[PDB]
Amino acid sequence: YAVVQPLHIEELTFGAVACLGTFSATDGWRRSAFNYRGSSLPVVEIDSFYSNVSDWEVIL
Amino acid sequence: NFITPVGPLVENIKSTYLNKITTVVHGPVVSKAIPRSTVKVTVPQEAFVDLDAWLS
Amino acid sequence: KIHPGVAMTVVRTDEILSENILFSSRASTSMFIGTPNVSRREARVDAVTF
Amino acid sequence: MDLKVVVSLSSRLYTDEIAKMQQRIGCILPLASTHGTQNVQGLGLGQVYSLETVPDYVSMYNYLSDCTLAVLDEVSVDSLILTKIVPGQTYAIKNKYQPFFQWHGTGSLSVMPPVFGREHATVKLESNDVDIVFPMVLPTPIAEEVLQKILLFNVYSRVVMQAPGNADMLDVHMHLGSVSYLGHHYELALPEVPGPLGLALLDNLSLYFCIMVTLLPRASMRLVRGLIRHEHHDLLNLFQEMVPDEIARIDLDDLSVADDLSRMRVMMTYLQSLASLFNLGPRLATAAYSQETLTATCW
Amino acid sequence: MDLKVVVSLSSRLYTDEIAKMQQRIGCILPLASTHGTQNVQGLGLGQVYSLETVPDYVSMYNYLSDCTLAVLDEVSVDSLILTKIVPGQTYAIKNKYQPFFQWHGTGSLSVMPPVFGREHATVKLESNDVDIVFPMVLPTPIAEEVLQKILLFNVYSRVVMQAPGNADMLDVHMHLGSVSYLGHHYELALPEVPGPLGLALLDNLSLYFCIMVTLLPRASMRLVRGLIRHEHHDLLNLFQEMVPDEIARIDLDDLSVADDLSRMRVMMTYLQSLASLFNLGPRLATAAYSQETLTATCW
Amino acid sequence: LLAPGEVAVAGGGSGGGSFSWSGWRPPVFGDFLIHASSFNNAEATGTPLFQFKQSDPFSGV
């Protein structure tokens, strides 16, 4: 809001948020690697997921 | 608003020209393979941010 | 390090980790026992809790 | 599949409080842990709402939406038996809260902290050295009405710091102090000091206001200008013959549809997210209610 | 679990009215009572959308949110069979709605009151002297554009009636006349330039919108000035610069605390009731759709 | 598998008619047709997906 873009009509929005599902607290989201092409990527993994999508809510 | 979340992968057929992908929308994400194996949704750790620990 | 008009009184509390001894005389209490059970609850996607 | 908690008391309770607790059978109160056996310390709303600390009324809301509600089922000398409220089940719940509001069939209920009084909610357990504080539930139309009353007080009490004005602290207490209902007026207990987390909620509200004020459609402003003079209406009777000077100063340029259109498009997306700010608590859906039986079937 | 509901008719239907209702065999009807056997006076919206009194948009919205939906399965000479819509179940619907909008798989369907003509939503049953009215089911992104355009067309029509110098009607019909979503273009119909205040659906929606618009710059300015504290939300100062010059000059002394408190309270009750209105009410999600069979797999 | 309820009850008719057991709801699957060069086959089988809503009518991919 200070460096590049103070203000305009459409350009006011900042971002949105949606919900992707409910999983059990106290567990889940361990960390693991994703091995492909002789190189790894650290990845988290969630257990017992239950997919449940809602729409986007504007944050600003 | 033109991007709609769909859900985790469940099945993927690997085809030369037009693949066929099967996800699970609104339900217990469960593997459809014949010998069952637990499915766990994976997010790159670079992007995943625990909002509950940062708060603490 | 000059003195103000007043003094102070300081209070503090401490903990000891005692490792005690207990004595209970014979036939002190009488107890009644009920039958135990297992119950099912919270069947999630992969896991069921009992 | 099985939804039951057994809250065990350390010490037997007295014959007067077992009788008082039984009047609350069928009432909701939120417990801390979702486990089969628990202490009394997690049971009520009592820890967040204590006698030694000021009631925030917004940290209390945040405690409800985090906890897991349960319905009191059975009371004895050494136990209190409850059934927890989980998403995918239906429940039968009674209307037994003391400031009595009457429910409609096929309405939506709301759960809010004991706004009307500390004393209306608590059953004091002096045997177990605890006060069990029940939450107050309301119909949704009136619950939102009370939540608004509480927030505007956090602003206006602070705006009017110490004013000898007969107008001030008498208008803001007659307007915001009470909630009327069918043939009744119910006083609200409002905090002497508007604490944090209540002002921090109003800070977020303002951010939405600072945005919306730049994109207001002007065609909307010119309509109210024509109606406050030419026609007579009950909605606009609030404005007298006098017209807000701000509007005449805000609206000068001629109307253009293509601009007011995209103003409406951007604005409508903020109201959709604004609504998330107001719910601020758990909501129930009721499908059947008997005026005499005082038992709903909530979902 | 039994979801069937049998609607019995007082008198046999004509061989024509069977052809009319069979054409709408797959579609959602809101149900007065959740019991197994029912009357015909219950299912339509003829109670809320009636020929004798003026229809309201915000009144039908309050009804559809509470009501119980249902799906038509079979029509007999003297009968109507439906199946209730309840959570945790997957249903197959068809789209038979006279103004035709295309559906998409994995989208979000919304159930909104019929803002097009009555004739498109109704089926008249002269044999029982009732008309059954269906709600309209749009994809939510289409329903939003339709709402805010007919809402503006009502504000612009009433404005040009005051002084024709305000706006140009030909430029209005071409902007607000069309709706386009995902390469599909739909030319909606507009409610015939009503003319008096109080005869159409949206007139209460526009009045609640137009009054909330005018009160906002005054009410929003009391907040940011009243909220300034020692350590407030860090974004508070940044957005306060954003407000227009003409709003920053607002003098809070022009209105007494009593009148200022009255205007702010009226604004919040419209603001809160207008937020949830724009969420478009009860929504059905989708997981499949077939253009030729017109059948969506919704839950 | 050939049972009226949405979930299979074993034993055929035996133990059949409970219909209210832990409210186990089956998953609703979705099927997508993708350009094979757009999707890398080496994906984690569980990664969340996102569909961009195209703007050409009557498409098939």
DSSP per residue, D30-58:
EES--SSEE-STTTSSTTTS-SSS---SS
Dihedral angle computed from the Cα positions of residues E185, E299, E277 and D105, in that order, rounded to the nearest 10 degrees = 150
Whether D90 and F23 have beta carbons less than 8 Å apart is answered as: no
Nearest one of E18, E48, E21, E17 to E32, comparing CA atoms: E48
Residue D190 CA to residue D178 CA, distance in Å, equals 10
Surface of D (200-229) touching A: CB under 8 A: 207, 211, 214-215
The angle at the Cα of B27, spanning B22 to B31, to the nearest 5 degrees, equals 50
Surface of E (78-107) touching B: CB under 8 A: 106-107
Q: In what order do the strands lie in the sheet with D68-75?
A: D28-31, D68-75, D79-84, D5-8, D37-38
Which two structure tokens, joined as six digits, stand for E62? Answer: 């309050």
Bridge-partner residues for D298, per DSSP? Answer: D91, D286
For D122, the 3-state DSSP assignment is strand
> Which string of DSSP letters, residue by residue, matches B10-51?
EEEE--SSEEEEEEEESSB----SSS-----EEEETTT---H
Task: Give the Å distances, CA to CA, from E194 to D63, E169, E198, E201, F55.
Answer: 50, 14, 9, 10, 36
Strand D5-8 to strand D37-38: parallel, antiparallel, or no bridges (unpaired)? parallel
Dihedral angle computed from the Cα positions of residues E11, E13, E14 and E16, in that order, rounded to the nearest 10 degrees = 160
Distance from CA of A17 to the nearest CA of F (A): 14
CA nearest F40 in A: which residue? A36
- Judge whether F44 is closer than 8 Å to chain A, CB to CB: yes
Residues 6+ apart with CB under 8 A from B42: A32, A34, A43, A44, A45, A46, F44, F46, F47
Task: Give the Å distances, CA to CA, from F55 to E183, E186, E257, E286.
Answer: 5, 15, 53, 19
Q: In what order do the strands lie in the sheet with D91-94?
A: D91-94, D295-298, D283-289, D108-112, D136-139
Residue B44 CA to residue F19 CA, distance in Å, equals 40
Whether D172 and D160 have beta carbons less than 8 Å apart is answered as: yes
Nearest one of F50, D4, D88, D35 to B28, comparing CA atoms: D88
Q: Tell me the H-state helices in chain E.
A: 15-22, 57-66, 118-121, 140-162, 169-176, 203-226, 236-242, 245-248, 257-278
Strand E37-38 to strand E4-7: parallel, antiparallel, or no bridges (unpaired)? parallel
Instruction: Give me the long-range contacts of D48-56 (CB less than 8 A, separation at least 24).
Output: D49/D113, D49/D114, D49/D118, D49/D121, D49/D133, D51/D118, D51/D131, D54/D191, D54/D192, D54/D193, D54/D195, D55/D113, D55/D118, D55/D189, D55/D191, D56/D191, D56/D195, D56/D196, D56/D197, D56/D198
Which two structure tokens, joined as six digits, stand for E174? Answer: 């071409």
Please name the amino acid found at residue E220.
S
**Chain A interface, best mutation among D67, D207, D266, D268, by max A CB count within 10 A:** D266
Which two structure tokens, joined as six digits, stand for D254? Answer: 């001629």
Contact of chains C and E by CB distance (3 or more pairs under 8 angstroms): no
Whether E13 and E78 have beta carbons less than 8 Å apart is answered as: yes
Bridge-partner residues for D28, per DSSP? Answer: D71
- Judge whether A57 is closer than 8 Å to chain B, CB to CB: no
Residue D229 CA to residue D239 CA, distance in Å, equals 10
Whether D34 and D70 have beta carbons less than 8 Å apart is answered as: no
For D264, the 3-state DSSP assignment is helix
Which two structure tokens, joined as six digits, stand for C43? Answer: 């069947």
Whether D9 and D80 have beta carbons less than 8 Å apart is answered as: yes
> Which string of DSSP letters, residue by residue, matches E67-106?
SEEEEEEEEETTEEEEEE--TT--EEEE---SS-----TT
Nearest one of A55, B33, A49, B35 to F47, comparing CA atoms: A49
Residues E46-77: b if buried by 16+ CB within 10 A, e if exposed? bebbeeeeebbbeebbebbebbbbbbbeebee
Position of tokens 């350590």? E231
Residue D31 CA to residue D42 CA, distance in Å, equals 6
Residue F30 CA to residue F49 CA, distance in Å, equals 11
Bridge-partner residues for A51, per DSSP? Answer: A21
Residue D136 CA to residue D118 CA, distance in Å, equals 11
**Chain D: partners with 3+ C-beta pairs within 8 Å:** A, C, E, F
Residue E282 CA to residue E48 CA, distance in Å, equals 17
Task: Give the Å distances, CA to CA, from D134 to D21, D114, F53.
Answer: 11, 7, 48
Position of tokens 């257990």? A47
